[PDB]
């Protein structure tokens, strides 16, 4: 994995030794080269994972998350270079250093063979994200946002640490490859009940679980654009990755420990999607849509069938691309009208038609239009939850109504109707902005041609 | 009830608006032109009977039961003119009504495609920015203390001045752009 | 389709509809004939005149605007303003 870790670290002298006019160009270029390099992780086998060393491995779960992570860094640099144009040069380099450091922590979060090293990289991701939100977020509430993001995580993750160390004392190892063969069944007891909660609640916070989700519509809203891109696209998926690894050790107790959380997710995706119908802040609407989409990934991981894991990893990759694009579109309107109020700037298709086409494609992927990988993940989770219980289709199908309703309402409010008369600073779309939208949307649509690389380890 | 200049509707205005609504709904009920023409003369005869009514309480009572008469006898789908609110072509062309300020954001290669148009646009912009301070100081020397009472704007009073707040009335888009 | 309106055409059609009205003699009518002060018409007659203008040109004049059109020239100027004639 060290052929990816070392160039990601070499981005640090690359950004700190660059000429002052070259720090976006150089980091964008070489992060795109690292992202091109990331496709060598697609040496996956039908039986074995790609096991590099004692410290690092990559199966078909971690590989698309790695490719998406390494792809998101150039797009974050493109998204962030405009609103940091007037910034001090050293603070600009510190911002890029926090993004590079976050990429470095993420790529060895997903490839960590041993679970306590997964824990340390998983929690190490908090510090650059907290710094990016509280230092380069725009408003006052970022400070409060930085507290919620910090303290819902750690209150969930410090019982995980203890739990993992307990497994270290019980199994003798936290190697996931060893734990594939030495896993013992976890019977019904109170000790194993709180073992289950300590193993699961940190990832439940990261997803987020409904009812634990309150950090997200502050953290993703108050963040700068690169912060929101990495929070929605990658850091939510640390929870899903960690659940898919940790539920190996939690059988068969999961078969009744999942029942409350499944309810919290199945009703929660009804709630948060409904919340999106009455959001006045566009970026808050995109955040609540992320909570609603990750509720399906929670249900799919908890019912733990092959179809549900395939749907959940497809939905994680698809939601990463779609939610990152939606935050970038909302930012492209924020960088013109300087307000996140969705009803403010209307009729934007009359003024910005190609950006309206990007809004259309991102809305269509948000509502899971076939054959997008959004629909592939959505549909496969719906198949597996119908097999779990046939009544879930009600809460599934009603969700797909509301998901359509808030996706097009967002599209109707901002793009359609009459333009606002008094707003006259709607600049034509920059090449950087359309480029950012296309670098989200074109890989997302090309993955429909060959979705087997985003279907995870039990494709 | 809600008017830009007046604070209310007078009794005479309420009677005339009822008369126009009743004739339009009667034309919707009475599709054919001779049949509408007969019943419209009968409705005009009903309006001329209480025309010379001096008791305003009696006239207000007659207006109120005439509104109840209209509400019982209205058409469920009255005729709406196509560009009128509720019509089938209402606000259809608003997607084509691009505001004029977007021409400021054109590239010089596409402004050079229309040299005389933009040369004529720049003297409109020059006229507007030399008229602005005179029309602001016209508004503040003519508005009473406490703010304007009605939403009516004054005309230009001098020879050479433009009417205050004229630009978005004059440079509004066409109805068929 | 949709032939363009001129000021002379709007004026001719407005005076045409008013000459086809039995409470107005067509020899006293001009473009500046006030309906109440020169032609001696009622306010109900003015409402009917504006409704015939609406039926003539195919669009609705609202009541806050219809109550102020008291000569043929004001009607012609209103239809000119609402249809953007002499572009």
């Amino acid at each position: 994995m060290l052929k990816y870790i070392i160039p990601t670290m070499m981005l640090m002298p690359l950004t700190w030794l660059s000429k002052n006019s070259m720090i976006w160009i150089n980091t964008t270029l070489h992060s795109l080269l690292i992202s091109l390099t990331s496709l060598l992780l697609l040496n996956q086998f039908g039986d074995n994972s790609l096991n590099f060393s004692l410290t690092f491995f990559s199966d078909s779960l971690s590989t698309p998350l790695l490719i998406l992570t390494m792809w998101l860094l150039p797009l974050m640099l493109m998204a962030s270079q405009h609103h940091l144009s007037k910034e001090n040069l050293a603070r600009k380099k510190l911002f890029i250093s926090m993004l590079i450091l976050l990429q470095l922590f993420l790529i060895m979060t997903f490839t960590a063979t041993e679970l306590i090293f997964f824990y340390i990289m998983f929690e190490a991701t908090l510090v650059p994200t907290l710094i990016i939100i509280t230092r380069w977020g725009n408003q006052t509430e970022r400070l409060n946002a930085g507290l919620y993001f910090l303290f819902y995580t750690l209150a969930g993750s410090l019982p995980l640490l203890v739990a993992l160390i307990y497994i270290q004392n019980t199994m003798g190892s936290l190697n996931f490859l060893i734990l594939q063969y030495w896993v013992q069944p976890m019977p019904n007891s109170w000790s194993n009940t709180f073992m289950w909660l300590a193993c699961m609640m940190a990832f439940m916070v990261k997803m987020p679980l409904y009812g634990l989700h309150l950090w997200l519509p502050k953290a993703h809203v108050e963040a700068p654009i690169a912060g929101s891109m990495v929070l929605a696209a990658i850091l939510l998926k640390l929870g899903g990755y960690g659940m898919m690894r940790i539920t190996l050790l939690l059988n068969p107790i999961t078969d009744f420990m999942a029942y409350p959380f499944i309810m919290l997710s199945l009703w929660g995706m009804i709630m948060t999607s409904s919340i999106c119908l009455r959001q006045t802040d566009l970026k808050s609407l995109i955040a609540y849509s992320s909570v609603s989409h990750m509720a399906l990934v929670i249900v799919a991981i908890l019912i733990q069938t092959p179809w549900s894991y395939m749907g959940a990893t497809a939905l994680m990759i698809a939601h990463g691309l779609t939610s990152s694009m939606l935050f970038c579109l909302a930012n492209s309107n924020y960088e013109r009208v300087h307000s996140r109020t969705m009803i403010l700037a209307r009729g934007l298709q009359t003024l910005l038609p190609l950006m309206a086409a990007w809004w259309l494609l991102a809305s269509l992927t948000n509502l899971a239009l076939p054959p997008s990988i959004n629909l592939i993940g959505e549909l496969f989770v719906v198949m597996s939850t119908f097999s779990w219980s046939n009544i879930t289709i009600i809460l599934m199908g009603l969700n797909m109504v509301i998901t359509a309703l808030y996706s097009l309402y967002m599209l109707i409010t901002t793009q359609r109707g009459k333009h606002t008369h008094h707003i006259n600073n709607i600049l034509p779309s920059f090449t950087r902005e359309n480029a950012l939208m296309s670098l989200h949307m074109l890989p997302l649509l090309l993955l429909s041609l060959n979705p087997k690389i985003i279907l995870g380890p039990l494709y | 009830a809600f008017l830009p200049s007046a604070a209310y509707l007078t009794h005479q205005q309420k009677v005339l608006q009822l008369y126009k609504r009743a004739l339009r709904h009667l034309e919707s009920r009475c599709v054919h032109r001779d049949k509408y023409r007969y019943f419209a003369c009968l409705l005009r005869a009903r309006f001329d009977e209480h025309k010379n009514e001096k008791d305003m309480v009696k006239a207000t009572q007659l207006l109120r039961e005439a509104e109840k008469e209209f509400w019982h006898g209205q058409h469920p789908q009255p005729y709406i003119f196509p560009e009128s609110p509720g019509g089938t072509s209402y606000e259809r062309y608003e997607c084509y009504k691009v505001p004029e300020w977007c021409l400021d954001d054109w590239h010089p290669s596409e402004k050079a495609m229309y040299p005389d148009y933009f040369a004529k646009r720049e003297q409109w912009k020059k006229l507007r920015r030399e008229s602005w301070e005179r029309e602001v100081k016209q508004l503040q020397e003519e508005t009473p203390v406490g703010g304007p009472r009605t939403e009516a704007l004054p005309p230009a009073r001098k020879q050479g001045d433009l009417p205050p707040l004229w630009w978005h009335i004059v440079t509004r888009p066409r109805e068929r752009p | 389709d949709a032939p363009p309106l001129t000021l002379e055409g709007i004026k001719d059609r407005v005076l045409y509809v008013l000459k086809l009205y039995d409470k107005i003699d067509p020899e006293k009518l001009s473009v500046n004939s006030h309906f109440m002060k020169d032609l001696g018409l009622d306010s109900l007659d003015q409402v009917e005149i504006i409704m015939a203008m609406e039926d003539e040109f195919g669009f609705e004049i609202p009541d806050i605007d219809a109550e102020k059109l008291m000569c043929p020239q004001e009607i012609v100027d209103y239809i000119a303003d609402k249809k953007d004639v002499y572009e």
Partner: peptide
Amino acid sequence: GKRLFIIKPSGFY
């Protein structure tokens, strides 16, 4: 005859 300018946003970019 009587061709009218169509106001539209900038399609260059």
